Every structure is written in C-alpha cells, then in structure tokens.
Amino acid sequence: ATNFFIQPITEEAEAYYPPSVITNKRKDLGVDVYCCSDLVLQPGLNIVRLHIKVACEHMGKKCGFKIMARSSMCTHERLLILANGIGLIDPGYVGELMLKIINLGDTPVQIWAKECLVQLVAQGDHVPDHINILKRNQIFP
Amino acid sequence: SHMMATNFFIQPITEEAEAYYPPSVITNKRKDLGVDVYCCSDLVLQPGLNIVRLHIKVACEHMGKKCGFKIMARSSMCTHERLLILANGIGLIDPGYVGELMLKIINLGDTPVQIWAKECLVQLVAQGDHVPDHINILKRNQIFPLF
Amino acid sequence: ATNFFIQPITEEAEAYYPPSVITNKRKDLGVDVYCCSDLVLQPGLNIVRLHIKVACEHMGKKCGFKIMARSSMCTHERLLILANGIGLIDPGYVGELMLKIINLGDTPVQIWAKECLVQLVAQGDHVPDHINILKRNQIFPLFAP
Ligand SMILES: O=c1ccn([C@H]2C[C@H](O)[C@@H](COP(=O)(O)O)O2)c(=O)[nH]1
Ligand SMILES: O=c1ccn([C@H]2C[C@H](O)[C@@H](COP(=O)(O)O)O2)c(=O)[nH]1
Ligand SMILES: O=c1ccn([C@H]2C[C@H](O)[C@@H](COP(=O)(O)O)O2)c(=O)[nH]1
Ligand SMILES: [Mg+2]
Ligand SMILES: [Mg+2]
C-alpha cells in the first residue's frame, strides 16, 4: 500500500544505508534519515545535504512526501529548526534531498553522522509498509 | 470507502485543567480541522527552548482505530511583542503515546514573555488532516482504555 | 478530484492573477502564491496579506488546506520563517489569506511582488488537478458564509 525507496548517493551514505528491505512492524509514521556526515552548524542558516535519493509510493503510484523534524532536533543546547517548517517533496522530484537548518543559537553546534535530525512522512500521513534501501549502483524500482 | 469517523479524546490531568475542560462532548459543526487546546496555567517562558506541559492526555481515533495527530501553532501564539514559535515546525505525536502532552516552544526574543492560562497557542490535527466529528472531553478521575 | 480556486481581492493581486485555468501537469503538491506587492520586512514579526481568497475542493466537497514555506523563502541573506510553521486554513474560511512572517535577521529585508514565498497544499496533501483563477469582479458561491 505505502512504501519508501531510499538510495544513497555518496560513499558516506553507503555506510549508513546497506541494501535491505525493512518491514515497518512497529508501524512508525516517519522514516528517520541520517546526516551521514559530521557537520558544524554555524549560527544562522546552514545548507545540509541528506546524501540520498528517495521515492515514495502509495497504492502503487509514485507520490510526494514531507521532511519533518524529529522531536530531538531542537534541544536546550541546540536551537535548530527546519527553515521551511516542513520540507515538501513533490512526486516529480528525483534529486538529492536537501535541508535548510537554522541554528538559532549564538555559537556553532556539532552534529554527528549517526544522528537523524529529520524524518520522512508520506503524502497523506500514510504509515509505510516497507522501506526499501537500494544499492548506490542500483536502479530505482 | 466514502465517509469515515474521526474523534479526539481529551482528558484533563491537573486541577488547573479542570477549569477549561469540563466533562463534555463537543460537536464540530463548523468542520474546523484543528482542536484548540488551552495553556491552563500562566507561565513565563525564558529566551530559548521551553517545555510546556499542556495538562491533558490526548487520544485521536480514525475509523475506530487509534491514530497519530499533529500539533500545530495557532496564529495567536506569535505577537509583535512575543516572538514564539513551535520548536519542531509541527509536533508529531504517535498513537502509542499515553503520557501528558507537552509543547516545545522557542522564545526567539531577548526577554521573558508570558503565556496565559486561557490562551490556546496551538491546535491538534488528526493524522492525515481528517476533520474531527466529535471532541470528547473526559472526566479527570477516570480510567479510559484508549489511554 | 482536487481543485483550487483563487480569486484576487485587490488590484495588486490582479497584476499576478489573470483569469485562467491552470493545469498541474508536473503533479506538484503545492500551489505557489505571490506576495503581490513589494514589502520591507522588519526584524521580528511582520503581518503580510496575500491579496487573495482561496477555496479548495476534493471529491466535490470544500476542504481545508495548509500554507507552507517554499524552500526559497529563507536564504543566507534573508532569514525568514512562517511564525506558525504551517498555516492551517479551515474549510469554512472564505476571507483573505494572511501571513505572519518573522525576519530573524538584524536588518530589514526586501521582498518583491513577483516572488512566491509560500505554497498552498490541500488537506490530506492531495495533488491539485486544476488551479482556477477567478475574476476579481464577481461573487462566487464557493466563498459564501
Ligand atoms: O526542504 C526541502 C524542500 C524541497 N526540496 C526539493 C523537493 C521539491 O520538489 C523541490 C522544489 O521545492 P521549492 O523550491 O519549490 O520549495 O526541492 C528539498 O530537497 N528539501
Ligand atoms: O511536541 C511534542 C513531541 C513529543 N511529545 C511526546 C510524544 C513522544 O512519544 C514523547 C517522547 O518525546 P521526546 O522525549 O523525544 O521529546 O513525547 C510531546 O508531548 N510533544
Ligand atoms: O497563516 C494563517 C493561518 C490561519 N489563517 C486563517 C484561516 C483560519 O481558518 C483562520 C483562523 O485561524 P487561527 O487564528 O485559529 O490559527 O485564519 C490565515 O489566513 N493565515
Ligand atoms: Mg481556529
Ligand atoms: Mg514547487
């Protein structure tokens, strides 16, 4: 009914997205995605790449989805917000997912490749059945 | 296929909340998407991140199954003299959560600002943006199975 | 299945919303919407009118929609966000769309009438099939109380 397809673009992303078919059994709404690189976020705006191409599918038809902050993105010591509130991904988009993150604080803050700052939410808030992680060399299903 | 039922269940947790949530069934005949929700207590929010308890337990139900909901700011939250925004753009609550609902509010200004018990800074929106049919305001001292 | 109806309220809106029917051939989720006049946004809160009445309809029934920033609204030289994150428009609202924009920088920033800072997204995120731009000088029952 509702499935995601994630393809790592970079060598760094490959370390975090080994090819795999995840069945979403706890029925999580959002698909957490990694930073894939350590980065230092300056006060103000930061362009943050997510190292992945993503396709979402609902009832067998390619559909859009939304990039949303995870609850832990903003903590007391890290005042980080998604510049656009919600990242709206149109079904026709086939490029790399990109983030704009504002560090509202006065000093830089460190993020680690292992962290998931944001989550992918299918158009319509449909809970995903499967999350397909494709090979870098692979071909989008 | 054609028409589904969507309902919210709000249960007050504190004595302050009982003032704003008398046991009641609210019918949503205006077909508003969101469910306004009170602060219940006067609070001073410091610059930066503030964790605000909402004094309620919330369940959302769609087609008879417990579902998630979304916390969204109301227009009244941010005023010229009170630069307030929801921390995570939109709050995302999973159906399994049965704790007290909490806001993450960022005070963007340099000075402390006040929120007041009677204000609704935020509204609850069912997973998938379904218009609620009923808002059930449950008695405080009750055991309810959906929680 | 899912249609937007946009009606310009002001003469400034008419500069950007000529009467026409737009097809959404790319199947984008959002409907880009213009500022309609040049504005100076001071540091802190700014109330910004959008000069339009909008109705959304899905499967023959009036529904809600959401105002969302476009990723181009915020750049290194203009630190702009929507105060409310997402603007929730109830299916019964038939007045002018209004925006609360926070300029997080320390200096006024200039936005131009032709820029589209936000987009409209149907309730439930349904892809729009048609975007109808209605004539200003007309009363339409979809916008009745
Ligand atoms: O946070 C975001 C928002 C959008 N996009 C991509 C997918 C969209 O289809 C495309 C154009 O978006 P606007 O510039 O029209 O918002 O950019 C992102 O990668 N990240
Ligand atoms: O804005 C929010 C986000 C989350 N939660 C609840 C639901 C989650 O299951 C639980 C854990 O969230 P963190 O401790 O990760 O914030 O808190 C809230 O009450 N408000
Ligand atoms: O950014 C926004 C949010 C809301 N509204 C309109 C549509 C809503 O139905 C109405 C009341 O919304 P609150 O004041 O309840 O957010 O205001 C806007 O014009 N712009
Ligand atoms: Mg309201
Ligand atoms: Mg677009």
First to last CA, chain C: 23
The Cα-based distances of A67 to A25, A108, B66, B127 in angstroms read 21, 23, 23, 15
The count of other CB atoms within 10 Å of the CB of residue A31 is: 20
Strand (E) or helix (H) holding C12: helix C11-14
Q: What is the number of the ligand closest to the CA of C89?
A: 3
| Cα distance between residue B99 and residue A25, in whole Å | 22
For residue C139, the one-letter residue type is I
Q: Note the residue count of chain B.
A: 147
**Residue A87, domain extent:** 1-141
| Cα distance between residue C93 and residue A105, in whole Å | 37
C143 three-state secondary structure:
helix
User: Contact, B90 vs A68, CB < 8 A?
Assistant: yes
User: Contact, C39 vs C94, CB < 8 A?
Assistant: no
C125 three-state secondary structure:
helix
Q: How many separate domains does chain B show?
A: 1
Beta bridge partner(s), residue C32: C119
User: Contact, A80 vs A46, CB < 8 A?
Assistant: no
Name every residue whose Cβ is closer than 8 Å to that of residue B107 and which is 6 or more positions away in sequence: B45, B46, B47, B48, B50, B83, B84, B113
Please check whether residue A75 touches C, CB under 8 A: no
Say how many Å lie between the CA of residue B147 and the centre of ligand 4: 26
Closest to A102 in 3D by CA, of A42, A40, A50: A42
Taking the CA atoms of B105, B111, B116 and B121 in sequence, report the sign of the dihedral they define. negative
Ligand 2 atom having least distance to the Cα of B86: 1
Smallest Cα distance from C141 to chain B, Å: 17
Closest to B54 in 3D by CA, of B86, B89, B7, B6: B86
Strand (E) or helix (H) holding C80: strand C80-82
- Enumerate the residues of chain C whose CB falls inside 8 A of the CB of residue A91: 27, 29, 127
Closest to A117 in 3D by CA, of A102, A133, A132, A96: A102
User: Contact, B94 vs B28, CB < 8 A?
Assistant: no
| Cα distance between residue B147 and residue B139, in whole Å | 13
Method of determination is X-ray
The token duo for C95 is 């007045």
For residue A120, the one-letter residue type is L
Strand (E) or helix (H) holding A20: strand A20-23
Helices and strands per DSSP (H, E), number in chain A? 1, 14
Interchain pair A90, C124: CB under 8 A: no
The Cα-based distances of C57 to C3, C50, C126, C132 in angstroms read 5, 20, 10, 11
